[PDB]
Amino acid sequence: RPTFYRQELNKTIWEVPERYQNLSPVGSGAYGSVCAAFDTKTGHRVAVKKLSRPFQSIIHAKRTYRELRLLKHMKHENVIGLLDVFTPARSLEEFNDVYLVTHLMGADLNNIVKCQKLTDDHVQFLIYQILRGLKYIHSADIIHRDLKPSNLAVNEDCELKILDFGLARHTDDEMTGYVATRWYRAPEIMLNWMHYNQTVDIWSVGCIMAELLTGRTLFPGTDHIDQLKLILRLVGTPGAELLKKISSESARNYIQSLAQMPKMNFANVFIGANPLAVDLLEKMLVLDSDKRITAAQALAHAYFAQYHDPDDEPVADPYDQSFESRDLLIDEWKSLTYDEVISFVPPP
Template identity: 75%
Template sequence: MTEQPAEKIKPNFYRVELNRTIWEIPERYQMLTPIGSGAYGQVCSAFDQQLQHKVAIKKLARPFQSEIHAKRSYRELRLLKHMEHENVIGLLNVMTPTLTFEDFQDVYLVTPLMGADLNNIVKCQKLTDDHVQFLVYQVLRGLKYIHSAGIIHRDLKPSNIAVNEDCELKILDFGLARLADDAMTGYVATRWYRAPEIMLNWMHYNKTVDIWSVGCIMAELLTGRTLFPGTDHIDQLKRIMELVGTPDQEFLQKISSESARSYVESLPKQSKKDFRGYFQGANPDAVDLLDKMLILDTDKRLTAEQALEHPYMRQYHDPTDEPTAAAYDDSFEKMELNVAEWRKLMYEEVEGPGRAAGGEGLGPEAMEQ
C-alpha cells in the first residue's frame, strides 16, 4: 500500500494504491483493505473515523465506459439512496474526489460492512428451526419494504443476503439484475434460485419472483443443501417439476410465450410431491410456508406481506414494525441517453442536495444507518 502526492482532488481527500488501482477518498476512511472485486467495481473495508466503525467502500469500475455501464451505475446509486430499512443495504455516503464536473470519472459508494453471507452460514453450521425462522422473517421484512417501493429484486440468492454475528440480516444488490445483464454476470448458481417464469421468459413476471427465491433459500437453510441445483435451464426445470408437479391447464393458459407453452406441454406429466415427506423432520409450519411459496402459478404464490402473516412467522411478526417505502421513481429506466448525459445525471446525484457539509456525504439521517 503506497501513498502518493495528491493533486487536483478535494481537500481532506487522500490518494492510495490498492491492487494496482488508485483510490482517492476522504481522510475519515482509514485502514483500507481489499475484500472483493467484480465486473462492476472493487470493494474495500475501511475504518470510518467519524462513525467509529468499519464500513465497505465500493469504487465503481469505469462507470462511464459505455451507456450500459453508465445507466447501471446510475441505477445502483439511485436504488441505494432510496433504501432506508434495517434489512436492506443502504447508503452511508457517496463521493467523488474531483473538484469539477470536467474531471468527474470516479464514484465511491459507502455502505455498512457486513460479515458473512447466507452461503457461509449454510456451509458452516446446522441451523436450528428458530434460526431459520428469524433469518427468513428478516428476508421477508426486507422484501416487503423493497416491493412496496415498486422494486423487484430479481436475483435473490444466499450470496446476496448478508448476516452479521448477531444474526441480523440485510438484502444486497436488489433491482440490479436486468435481463440485458444476464449474459454479463456468468454466475451459474444464480439460476438455482430463479423463478421458472423469469428463467424461461414465460410471461411478464411480478414481485412474487422473489418469493420463489425465498422458498429455495429457506429450503436450503432447513436441509443444508441446494433445493434445485440444475446443471442448465432444462435440468433446472426438470428438478422443479419433480417437486412441484407439471403446470395445470389453468396456468398453461397464462404462459404468453407460445414456444415456452408448447415445450412445457410436451413434458411428461408429474404430480406434485407431498412436501411433508420431502422435508421430513421439518417444522410442519415451515413445510406449509414452503408449499405456499414454491407454487408455479404466480397469481397463487404468497406475497411478502402474506408470508409475514403465516403461522411460521408468528414468533417475530409485528405488523407495527414492518415498514413500507416511499414510491421509487424509476422513470429513468425508459430513458435512452448517451454516456455524457448519464454522466451529468450521475454527477447531479453524487454532488446534489441532501449532502453533508465538506463536499462529501449524505445527510445525518443516512449517516446513522
C-alpha cells in the same frame, strides 16, 4: 469539502477523504472494486467501492446512475444502505470517478452455512428478516431478481441484510450449467415463459428456506432443462389454466411434451420439519406465480408468531424510476449522476 489523500490500490490510484483510514482490498470482485476501511467519523468498519471511469458508454453511464439512485433510496434495517458517496472532482467538467461507502459485511449465509442444517428457531428469524426487507423493497415497485444465500449478509447476532442493487444484469454464460446463480430462479424467469413481476422473489425465498431446513440445495440442476424436471417433480406439471398464461408458443409446446405428474406430499419431502414451515413452503413454491403468497401476507403466517409485529414492518417512500424508460446521451447521464452525488445527505 474534505481534504483528500492518495494511495495505490487495486491497480489504480484511489483518492479518498482523510476520515477513511487503513484501506485494504477485500473480497473476490463480485460487487466491483472494493476495499475495507475504518471510518473515523462514525466508528464503523466500511466497504468503499471505486467506479473507475464509469461513463465510458451509454450502458455504463446509465448503470452508474441506476446504482446510485437505488442505494440512495434504500433506508431499511434489513436492506443495504448508503453511508456516503464522494468524488475528488471540484466541478462537473473534471468529474470522472465515483466512490460509494456502506457498512462492511463480514459473512454471508452460504460461507457460514454451506452443507449444514439449522435449528427451527434460527430458520424462523432468518426468513422473517428476508420477508421484512422484501415487503419494503416490493412496496417501492422494485424487483430484486437474484435472492440467493451469497446475497444475504449475516452477523454474529443472526441479523440479516439483503445485498445486490444496480449491478450488471447476469449473462447467459453466468446462468449455464451446474451453477448457484440459477438454482434459486423462478421457472417463469429462468425460461422466459411470460412477462414476470415481483412474485419471482417469493419463489427464491422458498428455495432458501428449504435449504436452511435440510442443509441441501432444493433444485441443484445441471442445466436449465434438468432443473425444470426437478421443479416439476416436486410441484407438478402445469394445468390448463397456467398453460394459457405462457405467452411463449415454443415454450408452451415443449411443456406439453412432458408426461404429466402430480404435486408431491411436502411432509414426505421435508421429513420432520415444523408443520407450520411445511405449510408456508407449499404457499411459496407454487408454479402459477399469480397464486403465490406475497411478502406482506407471509409475515402474518403463524410460523412467524414470535417475531411478527405489524407496527414494526415499514414500507418505502415512493421511488420514481421513470428514468428507466428514458433515452439520454452519455454526458446527460453523467450530469444527472453528478447532481445526485452533490445532493447526498448522510444518515443521522
